[PDB]
Structure formats: C-alpha cells, structure tokens
Coordinates of C-alpha atoms and ligand atoms in Angstrom, one line a residue:
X1 CA 218.1 23.1 102.0
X2 CA 220.8 25.8 101.5
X3 CA 219.1 29.0 102.4
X4 CA 219.2 31.8 99.9
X5 CA 219.9 35.1 101.8
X6 CA 222.6 34.0 104.2
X7 CA 226.0 32.5 104.1
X8 CA 227.2 29.3 105.8
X9 CA 230.9 28.8 105.8
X10 CA 233.0 25.7 106.6
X11 CA 236.5 25.9 107.8
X12 CA 238.8 23.6 109.8
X13 CA 239.0 23.8 113.6
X14 CA 242.7 24.5 113.5
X15 CA 242.0 27.7 111.7
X16 CA 240.9 31.1 113.1
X17 CA 237.1 30.5 112.8
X18 CA 236.3 32.9 115.6
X19 CA 238.1 35.7 113.8
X20 CA 236.4 34.7 110.6
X21 CA 233.1 35.0 112.5
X22 CA 234.0 38.6 113.3
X23 CA 234.5 39.2 109.6
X24 CA 231.0 37.8 109.2
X25 CA 229.5 40.1 111.8
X26 CA 230.9 43.2 110.0
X27 CA 229.3 41.8 106.9
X28 CA 225.9 41.4 108.5
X29 CA 226.1 44.9 109.9
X30 CA 226.8 46.3 106.4
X31 CA 224.5 44.1 104.3
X32 CA 222.2 42.8 107.0
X33 CA 223.1 39.3 105.5
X34 CA 223.8 36.8 108.3
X35 CA 227.0 34.7 108.1
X36 CA 227.4 31.4 110.0
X37 CA 230.8 29.9 110.6
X38 CA 231.1 26.1 111.3
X39 CA 234.0 23.8 111.7
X40 CA 232.5 20.3 111.2
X41 CA 234.7 17.3 111.9
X42 CA 236.2 16.0 108.6
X43 CA 234.6 18.7 106.5
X44 CA 236.9 17.7 103.6
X45 CA 235.0 14.4 103.3
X46 CA 231.7 15.9 104.4
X47 CA 231.7 18.6 101.7
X48 CA 231.7 16.2 98.7
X49 CA 229.1 14.0 100.4
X50 CA 226.5 16.7 101.2
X51 CA 227.4 19.0 98.3
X52 CA 226.7 16.2 95.8
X53 CA 223.1 16.0 97.2
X54 CA 223.0 19.8 96.5
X55 CA 223.4 20.8 100.1
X56 CA 226.3 21.9 102.4
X57 CA 228.0 25.3 103.0
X58 CA 228.0 28.2 100.6
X59 CA 231.8 28.5 100.9
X60 CA 234.3 25.9 101.9
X61 CA 237.8 26.5 103.2
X62 CA 240.5 23.9 102.7
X63 CA 244.0 23.3 101.2
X64 CA 243.9 23.9 97.5
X65 CA 245.0 20.3 96.6
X66 CA 241.4 19.0 97.2
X67 CA 239.8 21.6 95.1
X68 CA 240.8 20.1 91.8
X69 CA 238.9 16.9 92.7
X70 CA 235.9 19.0 93.8
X71 CA 235.9 20.9 90.5
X72 CA 236.0 17.7 88.4
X73 CA 232.9 16.5 90.3
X74 CA 231.1 19.7 89.5
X75 CA 231.0 20.7 93.2
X76 CA 232.6 24.2 92.8
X77 CA 231.4 27.4 91.1
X78 CA 233.9 29.3 88.8
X79 CA 234.9 32.5 90.5
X80 CA 234.8 35.8 88.7
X81 CA 237.2 38.3 90.3
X82 CA 238.2 41.2 88.1
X83 CA 241.8 41.7 87.2
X84 CA 242.4 44.5 89.6
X85 CA 241.4 42.2 92.4
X86 CA 243.7 39.4 91.1
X87 CA 246.6 41.9 91.2
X88 CA 246.0 42.1 95.0
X89 CA 247.2 38.5 95.5
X90 CA 250.5 36.8 94.5
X91 CA 250.3 35.3 91.0
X92 CA 251.5 31.9 92.0
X93 CA 248.6 31.6 94.5
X94 CA 246.2 32.0 91.6
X95 CA 247.8 29.0 89.9
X96 CA 247.1 26.8 93.0
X97 CA 243.3 27.5 92.5
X98 CA 243.3 27.0 88.7
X99 CA 241.4 24.1 87.2
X100 CA 241.2 23.8 83.4
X101 CA 241.8 27.4 82.7
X102 CA 239.2 28.5 85.2
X103 CA 239.6 30.0 88.7
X104 CA 238.0 27.7 91.2
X105 CA 238.5 29.4 94.5
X106 CA 240.0 32.4 96.4
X107 CA 243.6 31.9 97.7
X108 CA 244.0 32.8 101.4
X109 CA 247.2 31.6 103.0
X110 CA 250.5 30.0 102.0
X111 CA 252.5 27.4 103.7
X112 CA 255.6 25.4 103.1
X113 CA 258.4 23.7 105.0
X114 CA 261.4 25.7 106.3
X115 CA 264.6 25.0 108.1
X116 CA 264.1 25.5 111.8
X117 CA 267.3 25.8 113.8
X118 CA 268.4 26.3 117.4
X119 CA 270.3 29.6 117.7
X120 CA 272.2 28.5 120.8
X121 CA 273.5 25.4 119.1
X122 CA 273.7 26.9 115.6
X123 CA 273.8 30.8 115.4
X124 CA 274.7 30.6 111.7
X125 CA 272.9 27.6 110.1
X126 CA 274.3 25.9 106.9
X127 CA 273.1 27.1 103.5
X128 CA 273.9 23.7 101.9
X129 CA 272.8 20.1 102.5
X130 CA 276.5 19.1 102.0
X131 CA 277.7 20.9 105.1
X132 CA 275.5 18.8 107.3
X133 CA 277.7 15.7 107.9
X134 CA 280.6 17.9 109.0
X135 CA 278.3 19.7 111.5
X136 CA 277.0 16.3 112.8
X137 CA 280.5 15.1 113.7
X138 CA 281.2 18.3 115.7
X139 CA 277.8 18.1 117.4
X140 CA 278.1 14.4 118.1
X141 CA 281.2 15.3 120.2
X142 CA 279.0 17.6 122.4
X143 CA 276.4 14.8 122.6
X144 CA 274.0 16.5 120.2
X145 CA 272.8 15.9 116.6
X146 CA 272.9 18.1 113.5
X147 CA 269.5 17.4 111.9
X148 CA 266.4 15.4 112.8
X149 CA 263.2 15.5 110.8
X150 CA 260.5 13.1 109.8
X151 CA 261.7 10.6 107.2
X152 CA 258.5 8.5 107.3
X153 CA 256.5 11.0 105.1
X154 CA 257.6 12.0 101.6
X155 CA 256.1 15.4 102.2
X156 CA 259.2 16.1 104.3
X157 CA 261.8 14.4 102.1
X158 CA 260.5 15.8 98.8
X159 CA 262.2 19.3 99.1
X160 CA 265.6 17.6 98.8
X161 CA 264.6 14.9 96.4
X162 CA 263.0 17.2 93.9
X163 CA 265.5 19.9 94.3
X164 CA 267.0 19.5 90.8
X165 CA 264.3 19.5 88.1
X166 CA 261.9 17.1 90.0
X167 CA 258.1 17.4 90.0
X168 CA 255.0 15.5 90.9
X169 CA 252.9 16.0 87.8
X170 CA 253.6 18.5 85.1
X171 CA 251.6 21.8 85.2
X172 CA 250.2 23.4 82.0
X173 CA 247.8 26.4 82.5
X174 CA 246.0 24.9 85.5
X175 CA 246.0 21.5 83.9
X176 CA 248.3 18.7 85.2
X177 CA 249.4 16.0 82.8
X178 CA 248.8 12.9 84.9
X179 CA 250.9 10.9 82.5
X180 CA 253.9 13.2 83.1
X181 CA 255.5 12.4 86.5
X182 CA 258.8 14.0 87.5
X183 CA 259.8 11.6 90.3
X184 CA 262.9 10.0 88.7
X185 CA 265.9 12.0 87.7
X186 CA 269.6 12.6 88.4
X187 CA 268.6 15.2 91.0
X188 CA 266.2 12.7 92.7
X189 CA 268.8 10.0 92.5
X190 CA 271.5 12.2 94.0
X191 CA 269.0 13.8 96.5
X192 CA 267.8 10.4 97.7
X193 CA 271.3 8.8 97.8
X194 CA 272.4 11.7 100.0
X195 CA 269.6 11.0 102.4
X196 CA 270.4 7.3 102.5
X197 CA 274.1 8.1 103.0
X198 CA 273.2 10.2 106.0
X199 CA 271.6 7.1 107.6
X200 CA 274.5 4.8 106.6
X201 CA 276.9 7.5 107.9
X202 CA 274.9 7.6 111.2
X203 CA 274.1 11.3 110.8
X204 CA 270.3 10.4 110.8
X205 CA 268.2 7.3 111.8
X206 CA 265.7 5.6 109.5
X207 CA 263.1 5.1 112.2
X208 CA 262.9 8.9 112.8
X209 CA 259.3 10.2 112.6
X210 CA 257.3 13.4 113.3
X211 CA 257.1 12.9 117.1
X212 CA 260.8 11.8 117.5
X213 CA 262.1 14.8 115.5
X214 CA 259.8 17.3 117.3
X215 CA 260.8 16.1 120.8
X216 CA 264.5 16.0 119.8
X217 CA 264.4 19.5 118.6
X218 CA 262.1 20.8 121.3
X219 CA 264.4 19.3 124.0
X220 CA 267.4 21.0 122.5
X221 CA 269.0 17.7 121.5
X222 CA 269.4 18.5 117.8
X223 CA 270.4 21.7 116.0
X224 CA 268.0 21.6 113.1
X225 CA 264.6 20.3 112.1
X226 CA 262.5 20.6 109.0
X227 CA 258.9 21.7 109.6
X228 CA 256.0 24.0 109.0
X229 CA 254.3 26.9 110.8
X230 CA 251.9 24.5 112.6
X231 CA 255.0 23.3 114.5
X232 CA 255.9 26.8 115.8
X233 CA 253.8 27.1 119.0
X234 CA 255.1 23.8 120.4
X235 CA 258.6 25.4 120.1
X236 CA 257.5 28.7 121.6
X237 CA 256.5 26.6 124.6
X238 CA 259.7 24.6 124.6
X239 CA 261.8 27.7 125.5
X240 CA 264.2 26.6 122.7
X241 CA 265.6 29.7 121.1
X242 CA 264.9 29.1 117.4
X243 CA 265.1 30.7 114.0
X244 CA 263.2 29.7 110.8
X245 CA 265.0 30.0 107.5
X246 CA 265.5 29.1 103.8
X247 CA 266.0 25.4 103.3
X248 CA 269.5 24.3 102.4
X249 CA 270.5 24.0 98.8
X250 CA 271.6 20.7 97.4
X251 CA 274.2 20.8 94.6
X252 CA 273.6 24.5 94.4
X253 CA 269.9 23.9 93.8
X254 CA 267.2 25.3 96.2
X255 CA 265.2 22.8 98.1
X256 CA 261.8 22.5 96.4
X257 CA 259.1 22.0 99.1
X258 CA 255.5 21.5 98.3
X259 CA 253.3 24.6 98.7
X260 CA 249.8 24.4 100.2
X261 CA 247.3 27.2 99.7
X262 CA 244.4 27.6 102.1
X263 CA 241.6 28.5 99.8
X264 CA 237.9 29.4 99.8
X265 CA 235.6 27.8 97.2
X266 CA 232.0 28.5 96.4
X267 CA 229.5 25.7 96.4
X268 CA 228.1 25.1 92.9
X269 CA 224.8 24.5 94.6
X270 CA 224.8 27.8 96.5
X271 CA 221.9 30.3 95.7
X272 CA 224.4 32.8 97.3
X273 CA 227.3 32.9 94.9
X274 CA 227.2 36.7 94.5
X275 CA 227.1 37.4 98.2
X276 CA 229.9 34.8 98.8
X277 CA 232.0 36.7 96.2
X278 CA 231.3 40.0 97.9
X279 CA 232.2 38.6 101.4
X280 CA 235.4 37.0 100.2
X281 CA 236.6 39.9 98.0
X282 CA 235.6 43.0 99.9
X283 CA 235.5 41.7 103.5
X284 CA 237.8 38.7 104.2
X285 CA 240.6 39.5 101.8
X286 CA 241.6 42.9 103.2
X287 CA 244.2 44.0 105.8
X288 CA 241.4 44.1 108.3
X289 CA 239.7 40.8 107.5
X290 CA 242.9 38.7 107.5
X291 CA 244.0 40.4 110.6
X292 CA 240.9 39.4 112.5
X293 CA 241.4 35.8 111.4
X294 CA 245.1 35.9 112.0
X295 CA 244.8 37.3 115.5
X296 CA 242.6 34.4 116.5
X297 CA 244.6 31.6 114.8
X298 CA 247.8 32.8 112.9
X299 CA 247.5 32.2 109.2
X300 CA 251.3 31.9 108.5
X301 CA 252.1 33.6 105.2
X302 CA 249.1 35.0 103.3
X303 CA 248.2 35.4 99.6
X304 CA 247.2 39.1 100.0
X305 CA 250.3 41.2 99.2
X306 CA 249.5 44.2 101.4
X307 CA 248.9 42.0 104.4
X308 CA 251.8 39.7 103.7
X309 CA 254.1 42.7 103.6
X310 CA 253.1 43.5 107.2
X311 CA 253.4 39.9 108.4
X312 CA 256.7 39.3 106.7
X313 CA 258.3 41.6 109.3
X314 CA 258.3 38.4 111.3
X315 CA 261.3 36.6 109.9
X316 CA 259.6 33.2 110.3
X317 CA 256.8 34.3 108.0
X318 CA 259.2 35.8 105.5
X319 CA 261.2 32.5 105.5
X320 CA 257.9 30.7 104.9
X321 CA 257.1 32.8 101.8
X322 CA 260.7 32.5 100.5
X323 CA 260.6 28.7 100.8
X324 CA 257.1 28.7 99.1
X325 CA 258.5 30.9 96.3
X326 CA 261.2 28.4 95.6
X327 CA 258.8 25.5 96.1
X328 CA 256.3 23.4 94.1
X329 CA 252.6 24.1 94.2
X330 CA 251.0 20.7 95.2
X331 CA 249.0 19.4 92.2
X332 CA 245.3 19.9 93.0
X333 CA 244.2 16.7 91.4
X334 CA 243.1 13.3 92.9
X335 CA 245.8 11.3 91.2
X336 CA 248.1 12.7 93.9
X337 CA 247.0 9.8 96.1
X338 CA 248.9 7.4 93.8
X339 CA 251.9 9.7 93.8
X340 CA 252.0 9.9 97.7
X341 CA 251.8 6.1 97.9
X342 CA 254.5 5.5 95.2
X343 CA 256.9 8.0 96.8
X344 CA 256.2 7.0 100.4
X345 CA 257.0 3.3 99.9
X346 CA 260.1 4.2 97.7
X347 CA 261.7 6.5 100.3
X348 CA 260.9 4.1 103.1
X349 CA 262.3 1.2 101.2
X350 CA 265.5 3.0 100.2
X351 CA 266.0 4.1 103.9
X352 CA 265.4 0.6 105.2
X353 CA 267.7 -0.8 102.4
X354 CA 264.8 -3.0 101.2
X355 CA 265.5 -1.5 97.8
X356 CA 268.4 0.4 96.3
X357 CA 267.9 4.1 95.5
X358 CA 267.7 3.7 91.7
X359 CA 265.2 0.8 92.1
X360 CA 262.8 2.6 94.5
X361 CA 262.8 5.7 92.3
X362 CA 262.3 3.7 89.1
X363 CA 259.2 1.8 90.5
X364 CA 257.8 5.0 92.0
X365 CA 258.3 6.8 88.7
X366 CA 256.0 4.2 87.1
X367 CA 253.6 3.7 90.0
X368 CA 252.7 7.3 90.5
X369 CA 251.3 7.5 86.9
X370 CA 249.5 4.2 87.1
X371 CA 246.0 5.6 88.1
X372 CA 243.4 4.1 85.7
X373 CA 241.3 6.4 83.6
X374 CA 238.1 6.3 81.5
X375 CA 237.6 4.8 78.0
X376 CA 239.3 7.6 76.1
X377 CA 242.5 7.8 78.1
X378 CA 242.6 4.0 78.2
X379 CA 242.4 3.8 74.5
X380 CA 245.1 6.4 73.8
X381 CA 247.5 4.9 76.4
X382 CA 246.8 1.5 75.0
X383 CA 247.5 2.5 71.4
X384 CA 250.6 4.4 72.3
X385 CA 252.1 1.4 74.2
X386 CA 250.9 -0.8 71.4
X387 CA 252.7 1.1 68.6
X388 CA 255.8 1.4 70.7
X389 CA 256.0 -2.3 71.5
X390 CA 255.0 -3.0 67.9
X391 CA 258.2 -1.2 67.0
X392 CA 257.0 2.0 65.5
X393 CA 260.1 4.0 66.5
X394 CA 262.3 1.4 64.6
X395 CA 260.1 1.9 61.5
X396 CA 260.6 5.6 61.7
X397 CA 264.4 5.3 61.9
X398 CA 264.3 3.0 58.8
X399 CA 262.8 5.4 56.3
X400 CA 265.5 6.4 53.7
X401 CA 266.6 9.4 51.8
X435 CA 273.5 12.4 53.6
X436 CA 270.6 11.7 55.8
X437 CA 270.7 9.9 59.1
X438 CA 267.3 9.9 60.6
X439 CA 267.3 10.0 64.3
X440 CA 265.3 10.7 67.5
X441 CA 262.1 8.9 66.4
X442 CA 259.2 10.0 68.5
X443 CA 255.5 9.2 69.1
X444 CA 253.7 12.2 70.5
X445 CA 250.5 12.7 72.4
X446 CA 247.6 11.2 70.5
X447 CA 244.5 13.2 69.8
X448 CA 240.9 11.8 70.0
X449 CA 237.7 13.2 68.6
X450 CA 234.2 11.7 68.9
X451 CA 231.3 12.2 66.4
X452 CA 228.6 14.6 67.6
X453 CA 226.3 11.6 67.2
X454 CA 228.7 9.6 69.3
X455 CA 229.0 6.7 66.8
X456 CA 232.5 7.5 65.5
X457 CA 236.0 7.9 66.7
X458 CA 238.9 9.8 65.0
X459 CA 242.4 9.5 66.3
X460 CA 245.3 11.8 65.5
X461 CA 248.8 10.2 65.7
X462 CA 251.6 12.9 65.7
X463 CA 255.0 11.5 64.7
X464 CA 258.5 13.0 64.6
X465 CA 262.1 12.5 63.6
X466 CA 265.2 14.6 63.5
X467 CA 267.0 14.8 60.2
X468 CA 270.7 15.1 59.9
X469 CA 272.4 16.3 56.7
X470 CA 276.1 15.6 56.9
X478 CA 275.6 19.7 59.8
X479 CA 272.1 20.9 59.0
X480 CA 269.8 19.3 61.5
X481 CA 266.0 19.4 61.1
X482 CA 262.9 18.4 63.0
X483 CA 260.2 16.7 61.0
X484 CA 256.7 16.3 62.4
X485 CA 253.4 15.0 60.9
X486 CA 250.0 13.5 61.8
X487 CA 248.2 10.4 60.8
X488 CA 244.4 10.4 61.1
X489 CA 242.7 7.1 61.5
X490 CA 239.0 6.4 61.9
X491 CA 237.9 3.9 64.5
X492 CA 234.6 2.0 63.7
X493 CA 232.2 -0.5 65.2
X494 CA 230.8 -3.0 62.7
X495 CA 228.7 -6.2 63.0
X496 CA 229.8 -9.4 61.2
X497 CA 229.0 -13.1 61.3
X498 CA 226.7 -11.3 61.1
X499 CA 225.6 -10.8 64.7
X500 CA 229.0 -10.4 66.4
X501 CA 230.5 -6.9 66.6
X502 CA 234.1 -5.8 66.2
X503 CA 236.2 -2.7 66.6
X504 CA 237.7 -1.9 63.2
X505 CA 240.0 0.6 61.6
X506 CA 238.5 3.1 59.2
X507 CA 240.7 5.1 56.7
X508 CA 244.2 5.6 57.8
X509 CA 245.6 8.7 56.0
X510 CA 248.4 11.1 56.5
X511 CA 246.8 14.4 57.6
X512 CA 247.3 16.5 54.5
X513 CA 248.7 19.8 55.7
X514 CA 250.1 18.4 59.0
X515 CA 253.7 18.1 57.8
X516 CA 255.9 20.6 59.6
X517 CA 259.7 21.0 59.2
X518 CA 261.6 23.0 61.9
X519 CA 265.2 24.1 61.7
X520 CA 267.6 23.0 64.5
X521 CA 270.8 24.7 65.7
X531 CA 266.4 24.3 52.3
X532 CA 262.7 24.3 53.0
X533 CA 260.1 25.0 51.9
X534 CA 261.6 23.0 49.1
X535 CA 262.4 20.1 51.6
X536 CA 258.9 20.4 52.8
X537 CA 257.7 20.6 49.2
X538 CA 259.7 17.5 48.5
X539 CA 258.8 15.6 51.6
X540 CA 255.0 16.3 51.2
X541 CA 255.2 14.4 47.9
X542 CA 256.6 11.3 49.5
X543 CA 256.4 11.1 53.3
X544 CA 252.6 11.2 53.5
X545 CA 252.2 8.2 51.3
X546 CA 255.3 6.6 52.8
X547 CA 254.3 6.9 56.4
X548 CA 250.7 5.8 56.1
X549 CA 251.7 2.6 54.4
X550 CA 254.4 1.6 56.9
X551 CA 252.2 2.7 59.8
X552 CA 248.5 2.4 59.2
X553 CA 249.1 -1.4 59.1
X554 CA 250.8 -1.3 62.5
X555 CA 248.0 0.9 63.8
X556 CA 245.5 -1.7 62.6
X557 CA 247.4 -4.5 64.4
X558 CA 247.7 -2.5 67.6
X559 CA 244.0 -1.9 67.6
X560 CA 243.3 -5.6 67.8
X561 CA 245.8 -6.1 70.6
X562 CA 243.8 -3.9 73.0
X563 CA 242.3 -5.4 76.3
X564 CA 239.0 -7.0 75.2
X565 CA 236.9 -5.4 77.9
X566 CA 238.1 -1.9 76.8
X567 CA 237.1 -2.9 73.3
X568 CA 233.6 -4.2 74.3
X569 CA 233.0 -1.1 76.5
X570 CA 234.0 1.3 73.8
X571 CA 232.0 -0.5 71.2
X572 CA 229.0 -0.3 73.5
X573 CA 229.1 3.5 73.8
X574 CA 229.8 4.1 70.1
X575 CA 226.7 1.9 69.3
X576 CA 224.5 3.9 71.6
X577 CA 226.2 7.2 70.7
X578 CA 227.2 8.2 74.2
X579 CA 230.1 10.7 74.6
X580 CA 233.1 9.4 76.6
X581 CA 235.5 11.7 74.8
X582 CA 236.4 15.1 76.1
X583 CA 236.5 18.5 74.4
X584 CA 240.0 20.1 74.8
Ligands
BOG1 C1 236.9 42.7 112.0 C2 236.3 42.6 110.6 C3 237.0 43.4 109.4 C4 236.6 43.0 108.0 C5 236.1 44.1 107.1 C6 237.1 44.8 106.1 C7 236.6 46.1 105.4 C8 235.2 46.2 105.1 O1 234.7 47.5 104.8 C9 233.6 47.7 104.1 O2 233.8 47.6 102.6 C10 232.6 47.8 101.9 C11 232.8 47.8 100.4 O3 234.1 47.3 100.0 C12 231.8 49.1 102.2 O4 230.6 48.9 101.7 C13 231.7 49.3 103.7 O5 231.3 50.7 103.9 C14 232.9 49.0 104.4 O6 232.5 49.0 105.8
MG2 MG1 254.3 35.2 92.4

C-alpha cells in the first residue's frame, strides 16, 4: 500500500511542514518524483501501528528518543550516508541516531533548555545556581521573584540534578546499558537538596508548573525562567525584553540538560529507501532546504554545521547549542519510560517533603532500572543477584596467599546459546585487587558453566548445571598504581581453587531462580528456540 515511485513524509504539526513541502517541490522538479507531506495527529503512535502492518510513510520525522524503540521493532531501515556527508553534521547529533552500532536516521535539529532572563530586571544574569537566593531577597523587596520554572516535570529539574556526573542510562557506542542508571550520586543529592532548600527558603514554590512559570515570566513578575525554544514566541508577544543564555553552573559544574534531536527515519517497509536518502541528503539537509523549513516554522538550532553557523548569529540559538553541547543526549530506548516515572515521583516527593532527598533518589535509582526483560536478561540478573546474596564476594575475599585481597567483584555475565538452541553456556567474570605490603594488582578471570535441561522421575524436567570450569586462558593480572610469574603461579592454583569454591554456589543459585523463569527457559531449550542475543 506504500507506493514505489513517490515519497510520503510524516512530520509533526508544530514543525515547518509547509517549508518542507517546498523542499519536496524542488525535488519533484529535479527528479519528477512526487513528495507528499502529512502531519497526522499522534504520528508517533500511528507510525508503529501502521508500519508494523508494512504500511505508513516512507520517512518519519520525530524526536530521536523514539527511534531506538522503532529500530528494535524492526521498523526503521539502516541509513547509509558516506563519511563526507556525516562530516557535514555535528558528531554528537549522530550519536543520538545510533542504535547498536548502526545509524538509524538523519539528524535535523537540536534542542535543549536554556536560562531565559528579563534584561530589564536582570541585565547581567548569574552564572551560578548559588547566587540565586541572594538575588531573590533583593528582588522580593521590589515585589518580584528571582527564578520560576516548572518543578512538576523532571525534564526541567534534571539539568541541575545531573550536573555532576549524573546520567539516565549509560551510553556505549549507540548502546545504552539499561542496568546502569546514573540517577543517584553526590551531585544529584546536592543538586536536589539545593532545589528543596529553595522551596524551604521561600525562593521557589513546590506547586509551580509550566503555566505558572510561563505567566510569571511573561508578565515580568520573575527575573529568570528555564525553558526551550518552543517557549520563545509567547515571550515575543509578551513584550518582555529577554535574553537566552547558558544555564547556571552548580558547584562549578555546568547544568546538564537533556538534548532532543529532531530526526528523519526511513521506513523499513519503504520501496523508496534510495529516493528517501537522496531527498534527505541532497535536498533537505542543505543551507537552502533547512532555510525553507526554518522560515515556515523555526527549527531552533540545527545539526547541519553550515546552516547552524548562520543561525547562531541569533544569540538565543547559539545559547541553545551551547546548552546542548554541555547536555546529555536523551537515551533513545523505551526503558526511558520507567526512568521518567521514577525521577518524576522522586522530585515531586522531595519537593512536597513526602520523602527526604536521599530517600527519593535511592528509590528512583532502583526503580528506573526495574524494567523487566526477556528470558536471557532475566536469567543473568537472577544469577548475579543470586551469587551476591549467596555471598560470592565474601568467598572471594577469603581466598589466601603479604596479601590482603580486596575489592571483590562480580562482573557482567556472558550468555551463549547452542546453534541448535538446546544448550546454554554462561560466562562468569570475577575480580579482586591484590595488595602486597605497596604493589597493588588487579586479578580477573572467567568461569564457564553449562546450563542443561534434563528429564528425571523420569517424566519431570529440571534445569541443571553442566560442567563448571575455570576458563583456561581467561586469567588476567593487571598492574595498579612480578608477572608473568605471578600469573604463571596463579594459573596453577586459582583456576582449580575458584571453580571449587564457586561452581557449588553457582549450582545453588541456579535452583533458587523464579520457577516460571525456569520452566519458560526449559521450554525453549527443549524446542531449540533462540532467546539469546548475538553481541
Ligand atoms: C526551497 C527548496 C530548496 C531545497 C533544495 C536544495 C539544493 C538542491 O539542489 C539540487 O542538488 C542536486 C544534487 O545534489 C542537483 O541534481 C540539482 O541540480 C540541484 O538543483
Ligand atoms: Mg560534536
């Protein structure tokens, strides 16, 4: 139902779709290929629905954070721009469109929060969060306020909270580790305490939301607000004389706002992928193509360097790019929905006093990572938690020859499935620091254990441990601030030593798994179906 020989494009109604249409006219003129621009209501839900029946637009425009979910569902084609083209766009914008090493869409525009200030009230705005209470007192005297912004949404509070070392999920080469959540930390504790202090100290109010902050700033009641480019036109109207600037630092750390990247993906079901590429690369992403769109509805900052250089002559757009460059690309994966909920309740609870700061952050740090996964992830989480409660770390510390063994560690488990799907193999990386006292070393090694399904009694089936054996060449000693003798030595002992203090525990932990997990896993091993992922 998608027609080969034309392009249908979906973009949101708040974007410059008429300008985009003009880009499409130019395209038809050159190629004779017709381009149709639509802005369906809720396209971000519509696209997965129709595209999963093999229908929908050839190209979809949307914030990058949805595209990770679309890629997982097989809805997006991999894009193949050459390196010279990639040099045309800012590198970090390419990271926003990465999924599993692959490029999954063309970056278009860049947006992040900025500090927006009233030049009549505040000709020289503060560079630090810390200055704000002082300003508020002064301004309270004149019947005004220092700072009002939406506290109801963690999107707005995150720049402060994550300022020092904080993150949503950890990024590795266009892969996010959904087990690794950076919510809780000294920065986040300090950052969030400060925010709560401001409410206790009367500088801000906990009930403040988007509409209250916007009115307050747009009526000239408050000197500063925190908002994005979408907010600008309402201020243009308000006759408030305003600047847009770098967010305040907290403890000398830049605020770290989330970055959205408007992006254009290509439908996996499109018969038109090559034309789509041609349109996006040689027509839309050009000084002329972006200008057309921008003149209709302004794009804010853009991913195209040449055009961004022009737009950045507007200090508001330059400030946007600068805040982006100091900010955190929003993870493009669906687990962000747990993250938003965890952080949203935490900040609201701390602000209301329903929880303390450390408590809200501690729950949120756990809750954001709590999204359930398929069999393989479940198994590996299960065994990790098992070994840890089963006291594996303690066992590590207790191995002898001075020495003092320290910093015992379980590392990310590996999982491999038989090509015939009937067999599982787990890798269990382990580590300790050695101290010769002086002379600190890092010892690491793997255990490989086979996981098996077997019938007994004689009908009933069970999940059983195969051979648990120290992986032969896996032992690695690393110097810290004399091998290979030590290694030579250790290889004669550790391997047999570890397996025999460990394999038994591994075997115990296996049995302590949730029973439905066990049954489910057994079932797919029996029938040789692959639940395990190539990495
Ligand atoms: C208002 C719409 C402007 C968007 C078009 C931007 C530039 C397109 O320019 C086109 O590039 C093609 C190859 O790269 C050439 O084949 C065409 O001759 C040229 O017209
Ligand atoms: Mg860059």
